[PDB]
Amino acid sequence: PKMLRWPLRFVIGSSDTQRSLLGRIGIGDVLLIRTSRAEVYCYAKKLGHFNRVEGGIIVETLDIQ
């Protein structure tokens, strides 16, 4: 009925860690971004990349499936 929503994530990075090294993590600790991205996600599907600009974000060709 077109009252629909899609939740988008603007992801800038990924890191693979051990479930057991948190919550050894607390405030002040730095978590490092091992894999660096600029993708847009909707649940698990990647829809495409994006560029940050002075206003916010501009998105290159975005998949729709």
Residue 59: name the closest of 41, 42, 40, 45 by CA: 40
Whichever of 45 and 60 has its CB closer to another protein, that residue is: 60
Interface residues for another protein in 5-64 (CB under 8 A)? 5-20, 22-23, 25-34, 36, 52-53, 55-62, 64
Whichever of 9 and 45 has its CB closer to another protein, that residue is: 9
| Contact between 38 and 49 (Cβ < 8 Å) | yes
Cβ-based neighbours of 8, under 8 Å, separated by 6 or more: 40, 41, 42, 47
Tell me which residues touch another protein (CB under 8 A): 2, 4-20, 22-23, 25-34, 36, 52-53, 55-62, 64
